[PDB]
């Protein structure tokens, strides 16, 4: 009954998935042994969206973890909440990706995806009414970006009607974490633009900014960064699992956010976020939430949205609140900032309300917005890619698996015309 299955790949994908399943389990009151210990009934009615059932009343997530090296899944199994996952859901090789898109997409993932496609196929038919898929992977790596995109294409060929949502960690060159990341980044986007229904880009530089300027904590770690993504990940589907004044699912958010099919790249943000030494002075009211929600520095991407026009925005509120202020605040912010919104669509903000706030908080909000300012990261990646590809640097590694430069040429254009067409809507007038 509109349940979604979760599939993740790569080191970044596995680490993010590890923190996400811990967050969801606490929301529904699931112990590390898989036994329900909730206190109300609202925490059990919609538990089948993310959890299966077995003998003894225990629940197992319908998650699938894939990698070309069992090194990453080695650490996740020994951590807390590691016994929740099915042993049969782990699919791995024994060679490795090599930070090479070609290896993860033509010579290693291709021969390995037969087994994982069987696992996801078993999960898809078992559920009552499949609602869609969600993806967590990084575009800067080999097995995540390479084999991940191949699975995206393969799944779409068998379920063309179900929804497909992705969480992509696109590389910001400031964290030059891989010298050959421009090759993988531009090749993954070209594959991603044709199949994925919704995409949500995430940047490590933005996450460092949040942990440093907003939370004001001295020593950030990937544990903290992964939790920020996990908190936003649950917010987009919170209304699907709990009652609310207005109900909204993945399909409803997509329908109200994508004017044209090729324009399906968003940015996400979460609020409230306050430091330990600064929440003594702040007040918890709806105007405060919408003030931090639209702040430029709060976005989880390196793209600054004050250089472009919001094509469309979406907000999902949590907790008990008055509907009037929710509709009033969105109208108020839309009028005072008429230069930051495109003009040929009136009232381009969607609102939804859920009655169950996150544990420990009384109010919350998750922001998903389609802004034309995201073209600036594609421009930066493309210009770096054409600089490296002009001299054919690092090319022999990709060509060694039979990959031809014609595919590289086509990857540039599809990214290029994406930027060109996505820019003229900023200058469009009515």
């Amino acid at each position: 009954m509109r349940e979604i299955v979760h599939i993740q790949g790569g080191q970044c994908g596995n680490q993010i998935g590890a923190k996400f399943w811990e967050v969801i389990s606490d929301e529904h009151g699931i112990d590390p042994t898989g036994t329900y210990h909730g206190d109300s009934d609202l925490q059990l009615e919609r538990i089948n969206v993310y959890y299966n059932e077995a003998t003894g009343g225990r629940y197992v997530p319908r998650a699938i973890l894939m990698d070309l090296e069992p090194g990453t899944m080695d650490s996740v199994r020994a951590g807390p909440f590691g016994q929740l996952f099915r042993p049969d859901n782990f699919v791995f090789g024994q060679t490795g990706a090599g930070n090479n898109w070609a290896k993860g997409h033509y010579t290693e993932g291709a021969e390995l995806i037969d087994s994982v496609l069987d696992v996801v196929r078993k999960e898809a038919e078992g559920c009552d009414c499949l609602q869609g898929f969600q993806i967590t992977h990084s575009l800067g790596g080999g097995t995540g970006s390479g084999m991940g995109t191949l699975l995206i294409s393969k799944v779409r060929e068998e379920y063309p009607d179900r929804i497909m949502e992705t969480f992509s960690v696109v590389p910001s060159p400031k964290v030059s974490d891989t010298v050959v990341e421009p090759y993988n980044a531009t090749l993954s986007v070209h594959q991603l633009v044709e199949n994925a229904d919704e995409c949500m880009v995430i940047d490590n530089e933005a996450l460092y900014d949040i942990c440093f300027r907003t939370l004001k904590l001295t020593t950030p770690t990937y544990g903290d960064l992964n939790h920020l993504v996990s908190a936003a990940m649950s917010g987009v589907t919170c209304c699907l699992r709990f009652p609310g004044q207005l109900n909204s699912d993945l399909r409803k958010l997509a329908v109200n956010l994508i004017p044209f099919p090729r324009l399906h790249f968003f940015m996400i943000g979460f609020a409230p976020l306050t430091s330990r030494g600064s929440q003594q002075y702040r007040a918890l009211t709806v105007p405060e939430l919408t003030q931090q929600m639209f702040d430029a520095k709060n976005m989880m991407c390196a793209a600054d949205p004050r250089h472009g026009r919001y094509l469309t925005a979406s907000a999902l509120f949590r907790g008990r609140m008055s509907t009037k202020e929710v509709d009033e605040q969105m109208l108020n912010v839309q009028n005072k900032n008429s230069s930051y919104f495109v003009e040929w669509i009136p009232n381009n903000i969607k609102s939804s309300i859920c009655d169950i706030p996150p544990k420990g908080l009384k109010m919350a909000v998750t922001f998903v917005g389609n802004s034309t300012a995201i073209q600036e990261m594609f421009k930066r990646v493309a210009e770096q890619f054409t600089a490296m590809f002009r001299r054919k640097a690092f090319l022999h590694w990709y060509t060694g698996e039979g990959m031809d430069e014609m595919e590289f040429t086509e990857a540039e254009s599809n990214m290029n015309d994406l930027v060109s067409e996505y820019q003229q809507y900023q200058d469009a007038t009515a």
């Binding site: 206190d39 009934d41 008990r320 169950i356």
Partner: protein, 200 residues
């Protein structure tokens, strides 16, 4: 909803006031003192413990209905010994107003006017006589069975071992009646008219 921390405390308070309006709205024969009497029947062994199914039956028989998630909230808060049984005695100890100070004046002064012997205990028959006189002008002093026939006006409360009405239970009976009526002026109107004493 989301009764993690103080959510449990605030969720019960909504039920505490929601019960009060329902009892106040009817304004008629429904009294909170019937709840303690109706729960004793289901308790059987005078344990003081009731499970969810029997607790729901008593409330619904009284005419008070809530949601399924609402009933679970009451059980978690009021299960002090963690045995899966709610404490109806603890539940009835709450949601009960103490009585306002001005209401205390009328309750005591009505008692004191009848209690002219200063002993603090009033013969139940004396209440029966004055309650009928204020209702009919042709009652006449003499009656055939003035004790039993007119005694139906009293004995709704309970007496001590001596049979005399203790003042402590005299105010206890009247304070519980002061839940179905939220209009203090109407509480004034009922008491002064039905007892024929008005002074404030």
């Amino acid at each position: 909803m989301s009764l993690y921390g103080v959510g449990l405390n605030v969720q019960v308070d909504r039920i505490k006031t929601e019960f009060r309006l329902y009892v106040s709205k009817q304004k008629g024969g429904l009294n909170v003192r019937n709840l303690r009497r109706i729960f004793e029947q289901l308790d059987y062994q005078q344990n003081g413990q009731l499970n969810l199914d029997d607790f729901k039956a008593g409330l619904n028989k009284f005419g008070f209905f809530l949601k399924n998630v609402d009933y679970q909230c009451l059980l978690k808060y009021f299960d002090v010994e963690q045995n899966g049984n709610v404490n109806y005695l603890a539940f009835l100890s709450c949601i009960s107003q103490t009585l306002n100070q001005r209401r205390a004046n009328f309750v005591l002064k009505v008692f004191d006017s009848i209690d002219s012997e200063q002993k603090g205990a009033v013969h139940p028959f004396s209440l029966a006589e004055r309650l009928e006189v204020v209702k009919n002008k042709d009652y006449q002093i003499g009656s055939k069975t003035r004790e039993q026939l007119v005694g139906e006006y009293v004995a709704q409360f309970h007496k001590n071992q001596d049979g005399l009405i203790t003042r402590d239970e005299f105010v206890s009976y009247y304070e519980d009646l002061g839940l179905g009526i939220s209009s203090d002026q109407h509480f004034i109107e009922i008491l002064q008219t039905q007892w024929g004493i008005k002074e404030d």
